[PDB]
């Protein structure tokens, strides 16, 4: 259908525009769709873009409004005092403000559907809420509506929620348009999605993006595909990957780099209310925090991630056990058998399960996939699925058998409940991945694994050396391989922190010289330098000119291939804020070749200082543009949990940054 009203180029300068005469007598029936293309690059704290209200004395609570906050939150109110209805639906982090310094045209579609009693909001091609109610309130069936307003809501004759921005186009339809019709509405998005709800991963949520540019020119990305809301482990999380062969313009359908199958891959709408939002999948194994590097010698791509056994995450991992037993000077994965109070088993050469109390092999072996065999026969467990049908989270058997894995809850043989690091490789640049192998312990038999720093590993330019940064209590622990990742050693670097989340990323400033930038607890990003390809590390220094919160945020970092202002350049990606994860910036630093000091010269605002920006990935694309894949929301805030399609990708040129 065509609209019943269509108008455009409305400037909202803290003064509402009355469109009652044009719209009110066109509204008919109980279903409506609002389509609005608008900009707001300097919004007020709380502002209404569109209102239908009863403006008369005594009816201040009879109105419909589409509103936004300077946080990027979008929502609606639908209120009628006589009916005793006060609906408020919203989602944080739904909007763009500016891109390349230009105000972004957001495309909003609100569907009010009387037949299905459902209100659905889309912004920029993304469904941000869909709410069904028992008692439906048609937006123009509000008692005594007599005003249609842009840039405010008229309540008792006064302008409430005054807006600053512009509405370039607005249309209203006397129909609830289908999800299919919605998908045909043209968009003006400044971003793309690589991973998204409903894709091959079937995860509704994503966190912890990475990006890495391969020698062939392919750009590879990995991510946590998070099933149980956006929660860290314990949960169900797999590691997914996607690549682009055209400088980031298009991306492949994701595949898994690391996955467990003890729980179903389910696309679930995780509850966001204050009673249930902390619901967490509690019996699934998971992967979390991935990192990528490419090896020049073998040509292999290598991906590491943390591995968590069923029900385990950082919060409850055994901090005094590596999960391995030391023997002769070798490390072997420990196992506990069904019924034993003790871990009386180890996994030896060729995956042979060996009894430590009897010093005697068993008829059990562990295959490459960490699956349990008895005399060559594959053992199985029944898979779980999750639901909130009952009114709370339930995890229950679903009738399907999957291979029995030592990382599962239901396994006959179970690993130590602590964190591990695993590695997988690809021989075809991300088209398929090998089965992962656990890395050995590096800090002794009685120390839990270090935690992988998400993002990129570092391939040194003048050699075959590969380095993945990791962190633990009191240090960064660099993992170093000179043989294509077949064997690893550690290089420990003390930091003045107990128990920091010291997520670190590295750049090679020049041959043999590595600077590592890392998250701290001081509100400042720190760094340290190695001049012997990672063997030894300097004291810690701090960057002035960028602020982080007390708890900090991952920082991504690259060494740019081209000179800027005649100098070698490093680019950092981080929120710049001491309040929350917002105010995303790329900060361009020029290197002083006298002393390798860095002058942070340009700060590029990714979007508004008040709009969300958390973990991020940056890479120089083969054409010397910059690709950024980032969490466009506050991933710390307990108000912005479980948002879909907030990890987004943009393309920038250096001239945009300067
Ligand atoms: O110099 S590398 O460390 O091999 C790397 C890629 N360099 C090319 C050089 C040519 C332009 C595109 C990027 C930078 C890291 O951020 C990874 O993307 C890998």
Swiss-Prot record:
Pfam families the UniProt entry points to: BNR, BNR_2, Sialidase
Domain of life (superkingdom): Bacteria
Entry-linked CDD domains: Sialidase_non-viral
Reactions catalysed, as given in the entry: Hydrolysis of alpha-(2->3)-, alpha-(2->6)-, alpha-(2->8)- glycosidic linkages of terminal sialic acid residues in oligosaccharides, glycoproteins, glycolipids, colominic acid and synthetic substrates
Gene Ontology CC annotation, any one: membrane
UniProt record similarity statement: Belongs to the glycosyl hydrolase 33 family.
Protein's name according to its UniProt entry: Sialidase B
Species the sequence originates in: Streptococcus pneumoniae serotype 4 (strain ATCC BAA-334 / TIGR4)
């Amino acid at each position: 259908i065509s609209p019943i009203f269509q108008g455009g180029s409305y400037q909202l300068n803290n003064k509402s525009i009355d469109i009652s005469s044009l719209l009110l007598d066109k509204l008919s029936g109980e279903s409506q769709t609002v389509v609005m293309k608008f900009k707001a690059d300097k919004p007020n704290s709380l502002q209404a873009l569109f209102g239908l209200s009863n403006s008369k004395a005594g009816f201040k609570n009879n109105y419909f409004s589409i509103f936004m906050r300077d946080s990027g939150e979008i929502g609606v109110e639908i209120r009628d005092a006589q009916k005793g209805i006060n609906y408020l639906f919203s989602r944080p982090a739904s909007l763009w403000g500016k891109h390349k310094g230009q105000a972004v045209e957001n495309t909003l579609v609100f569907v009010s559907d009387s037949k299905d009693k459902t209100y659905t909001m889309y912004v920029n091609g993304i469904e941000v809420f869909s709410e069904t109610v028992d008692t439906f309130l048609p937006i123009s069936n509000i008692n005594g509506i007599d005003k249609a307003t842009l840039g405010a809501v008229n309540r008792e004759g006064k302008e409430h929620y005054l807006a600053k921005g512009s509405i370039d186009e607005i249309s209203l339809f006397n129909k609830a348009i289908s999800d299919q019709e919605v998908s045909t509405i043209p968009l003006s998005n400044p971003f793309q999605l690589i991973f998204q709800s409903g894709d091959s991963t079937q995860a509704n949520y994503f966190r912890i993006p990475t990006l890495y540019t391969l020698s062939s020119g392919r750009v590879l990305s990995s991510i946590d595909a998070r099933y149980g809301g956006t929660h860290d482990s314990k949960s169900k999380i797999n590691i997914a990957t996607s690549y682009s062969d055209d400088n980031g313009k298009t991306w492949s359908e994701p595949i898994f780099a690391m996955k467990f199958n003890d729980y179903e891959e389910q696309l679930v709408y995780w509850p966001r209310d204050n009673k249930l939002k902390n619901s967490q999948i509690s019996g699934s194994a998971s992967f979390i925090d991935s990192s990528i590097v490419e090896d020049k010698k073998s040509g292999k791509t290598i991906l590491l991630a943390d591995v968590m056994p069923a029900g385990i995450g950082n919060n409850n991992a055994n901090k005094a056990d590596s999960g391995f037993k030391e023997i002769n000077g070798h490390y072997y994965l420990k196992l506990k058998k069904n019924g034993d109070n003790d871990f009386r088993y180890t996994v030896r050469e060729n995956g042979v399960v060996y009894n430590e109390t009897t010093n005697k092999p068993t008829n059990y072996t562990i295959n490459d996939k960490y699956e349990v065999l008895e005399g060559g026969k594959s053992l199985t467990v029944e898979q779980y699925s999750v639901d909130f049908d009952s009114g709370s989270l339930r995890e229950r058997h679903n009738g399907k058998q999957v291979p029995m894995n030592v990382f599962y809850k239901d396994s006959l043989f179970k690993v130590t409940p602590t964190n591990y690091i695993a590695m997988t490789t690809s021989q075809n640049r991300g088209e398929s991945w090998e089965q992962f192998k656990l890395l050995p312990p590096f800090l002794g038999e009685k120390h839990n694994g270090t935690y992988l720093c998400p993002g990129q590993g570092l391939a040194l330019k003048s050699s075959n050396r590969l380095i993945f940064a990791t962190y633990t209590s009191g240090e960064l622990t660099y993992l170093i391989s000179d043989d294509s990742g077949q064997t690893w050693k550690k290089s420990s670097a003390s930091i003045p922190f107990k128990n920091a989340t010291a997520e670190a990323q590295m750049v090679e400033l020049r041959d043999g010289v590595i600077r590592t930038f890392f998250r701290t607890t001081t509100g400042k990003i720190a760094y340290m330098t190695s001049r012997d390809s990672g063997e030894t590390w300097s004291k810690v220094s701090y960057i002035d000119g960028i602020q982080q919160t007390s708890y900090g945020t991952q920082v991504s970092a690259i060494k740019y291939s081209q000179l800027i202002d005649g100098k070698e350049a490093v680019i950092l990606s981080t929120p710049n804020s001491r309040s929350g994860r917002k105010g995303g910036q790329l900060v361009v630093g020029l290197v002083n070749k006298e002393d390798d000091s860095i002058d942070w010269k340009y700060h590029y605002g990714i979007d508004l200082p008040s709009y969300g920006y958390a973990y991020s990935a940056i890479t120089e694309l083969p054409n010397h543009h910059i690709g950024v894949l980032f969490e466009k929301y506050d991933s710390w805030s307990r108000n912005e949990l479980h948002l879909s399609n907030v990890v987004q990708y943009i393309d920038l040129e250096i001239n945009d940054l300067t």
